[PDB]
Design a protein around this ligand. Sequence first.
Ligand SMILES: *[C@@H]1O[C@H](CO[C@@H]2O[C@@H](C)[C@@H](O)[C@@H](O)[C@@H]2O)[C@@H](O[C@@H]2O[C@H](CO)[C@@H](O)[C@H](O)[C@H]2NC(C)=O)[C@H](O)[C@H]1NC(C)=O
Lengths: 219, 217
Amino acid sequence: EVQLLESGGGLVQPGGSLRLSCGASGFIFGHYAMSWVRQAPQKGLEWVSGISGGGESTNYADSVKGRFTISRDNSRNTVYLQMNSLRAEDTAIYYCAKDPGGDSSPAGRTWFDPWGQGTLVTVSSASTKGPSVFPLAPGTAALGCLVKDYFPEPVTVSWNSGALTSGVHTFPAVLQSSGLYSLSSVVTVPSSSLGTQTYICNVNHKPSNTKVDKKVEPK
Amino acid sequence: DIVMTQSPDSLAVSLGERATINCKSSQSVFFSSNNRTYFAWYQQKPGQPPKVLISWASTRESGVPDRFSGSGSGTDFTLTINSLQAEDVAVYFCQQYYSSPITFGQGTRLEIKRTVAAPSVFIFPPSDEQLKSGTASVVCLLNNFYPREAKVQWKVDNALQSGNSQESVTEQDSKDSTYSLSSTLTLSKADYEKHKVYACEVTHQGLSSPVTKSFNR
Ligand SMILES: *[C@@H]1O[C@H](CO[C@@H]2O[C@@H](C)[C@@H](O)[C@@H](O)[C@@H]2O)[C@@H](O[C@@H]2O[C@H](CO)[C@@H](O)[C@H](O)[C@H]2NC(C)=O)[C@H](O)[C@H]1NC(C)=O
């Protein structure tokens, strides 16, 4: 059961540095080349870098050559993307992807299976701001949380620490005129449960170490 | 680099019908010596990474339902999805692996057409917590409707509003093929307290006449 789990994304000032990591499990890691592929807000998928199973061979896209360094640890089963001299145009969701058959040459000249969930890298001069979360108070009622005025993306919203997942809609963030994002997460529940079932949204904004739990009660 | 161009950029297809997505490469990605086309199709569902569907232009990857098929060779390629299912809502990407750097198509967005479903409408006043900060957000929710096209109009004391609202729409649901939509009206605390009746009017193909949800204060 092949799994790839990326981490390390966040806000970086232009010219700054960031290192992404990708944890792999469920296969003999050292037998397979790994690549990083990114997806820009307005652009498509763009391959960034690939590395052979043992790591002796690497390849890079021209747009990142010399600023990005790919490496891997065949004991910790991790692949890394070191990014220096980051530019605004490096803003993207960065994915970890596996060479399906083994060790294709040049590194990365293959299709990929599978891909990780991606980690968002935002290169910007703007400063981090965490969200304020406000309740959206309510035979099925609707309620939710308003996640207002944060930067950069993303926020994650869970309900009752994951106990409530059915009927949840977390809307895409919309960029306000302030340069800050805002979104809502709503959920429909039986009206008969309102007074007795507690509803809490768990908002997580990793760029700012903001974790807020907001109780949503009928008014 | 090799340029991959998909056509169309987006399309809507009804459930049970056939969807066709095309991709062209700026050079042949067919090698004559080994009778192999170095081409692949991916599916990227909402919130998920891409998943490979087709390798070698036409080989269906393991686990992919056989209603997906890839065809073509050389420079002109086609992804065919028969008997469209709700879970097929996705962006479909092509990729060549003939020469480094591998390159991807810009993506084709697949929309599922389904029967009309009217939105469930809810309106939410600003929290007292938010009011102490000087801003009031009023939120209108349109839940689980189809088609995507909908008209949300804010009225304050029956006066039509403009320029102070924003909308957001969910990705199409992978199970029931509906959308949900939020409209957020943002007023200063001073302006919010100047008026009484806040109303959200929704116009939609599944509603025979517009539906209004409102509150006072
Ligand atoms: C050449 O190969 C085709 C199919 O092989 C390849 O399919 C992918 C791997 C991709 O690289 C394509 O571009 C290639 O064309 C052979 O066609 C198949 O033949 C069998 C019978 O032998 C038939 O049952 C299949 O349906 C055919 N599939 C397709 C897609 O046509 C073809 O016979 C080969 N020709 C040669 C070796 O001369």
